[PDB]
Amino acid sequence: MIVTSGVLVENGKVLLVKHKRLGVYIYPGGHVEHNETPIEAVKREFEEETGIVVEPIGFTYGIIDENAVERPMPLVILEEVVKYPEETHIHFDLIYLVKRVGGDLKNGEWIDVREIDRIETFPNVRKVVSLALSTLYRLGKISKLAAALEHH
Amino acid sequence: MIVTSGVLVENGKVLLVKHKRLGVYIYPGGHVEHNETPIEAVKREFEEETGIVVEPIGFTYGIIDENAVERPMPLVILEEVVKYPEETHIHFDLIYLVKRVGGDLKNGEWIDVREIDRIETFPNVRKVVSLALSTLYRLGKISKLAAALE
Ligand code: NI
Ligand code: NI
Known part of the structure; x- marks a missing residue:
């Protein structure tokens, strides 16, 4: 089934929640409901x-008109196999980099990335967080450059 | 609804088919069924x-382990409007660049990419082929001149 996740990193910490069934730490996310888009799903989940409100970000060519609007590219797409004694689940996970735009922390834990190698996470979470850090670094260079140009 | 499409470009031509209700040319594709992945749906569709068998390609960091395998990034993701008299639909379209791996042409037409304006096409078929050409050029599959349009 198609699922989606959101990666939120602020001040060297990533917001993770305990997996509903496995307990291990994972980025917030879940199944995309029947008539919702993955974009709406990741925000909702x-x-x-x-309790935190986010907006998915990601590369876009900027296409937008009366016929279609482009949505941002996920940070990475992983086709995950989750085995349970009862049944195996196949999750086609659109993992988005997201930014905080409101809300307040009601559940979940901000995990310092320097400690993540001694925290039990769902598979591939650390590699994905590392991809997010690199991406965020480049986004910051672009943002700083935009600001420096505003001085003209 | 989530749908998917495949963009196959060979020798400067792109393979398009006629949409059953709109009657305009579109990239082959369709709805992603709740039981299959977008990758399996675009191949099936x-x-x-x-009649041609394809494999989605695209950028990947190459992550793979006992627990997951990374899938290629779509060429572009467009939330498209389809208006039927009875209802306006919004399709969240994962558009994949694909490559031929087998099969044989049974339906559809190879359209010259510099001649897409000559036929009636679903909106943004042209913009998307331009992205496909640029991506194939970046991949070193075709030359820059072959990827230039307009
Ligand atoms: Ni589950
Ligand atoms: Ni339809």
Whole structure:
């Protein structure tokens, strides 16, 4: 099934929640409901699971008109196999980098990335967080450059 | 609804099919069923609609372990409007660049990319082929001149 997740990193910490069934730490996310887009789903899941409101970001060519609007590219797409003694689940996970735009922390834990190698996370979470840090670094260089140009 | 499409470009031509209700040319594709992945749906749809067997390609960091395998990034993701008299639909379209791996043409038409204006096409078919050409050029699959349009 198609699912989606959101990666929120602020001041060297990533917001993770305990997996509903496995307990291990994972980025907030869940199944995309029947008539919702993955974009709407990640926003909904993130706020229901943590109380924080986010907006998915990601590369876009900027296409927008009366016929279609482009949505941001996920940070990475992983096709995950989750085995349970009862059944195996296949999750096609659109993992988005997200930014905080409101809300307040009600559930979840801000995990210092320097400690993540001694915290039990769902598979591949650390590699994905590392991809987010690199991406955020480049986004910051672009943002700082935009600001420096505003001085003209 | 989530749908997917496949963009196959060979020798400066792109493979398009006629949408059953709109009657305009579109990239082969269709709805992603709740039981299959977008990758499996685009392969299934492309083969059912054209007879050609394809494999989605695109950028990947190459992550793979006992627990997950990374899938290629779509060429572009467009939330498209489809208006039928009875209802306006919004399709969240994962558009994949694909490559041929087998099969044989049974339906559809190879359209010259510099001639897409000559036929009636679903909106943004042209903009998307331009992205596909630029991506194939970046991949070193085609030359810059072959990827230039307009
Ligand atoms: Ni589950
Ligand atoms: Ni339809």
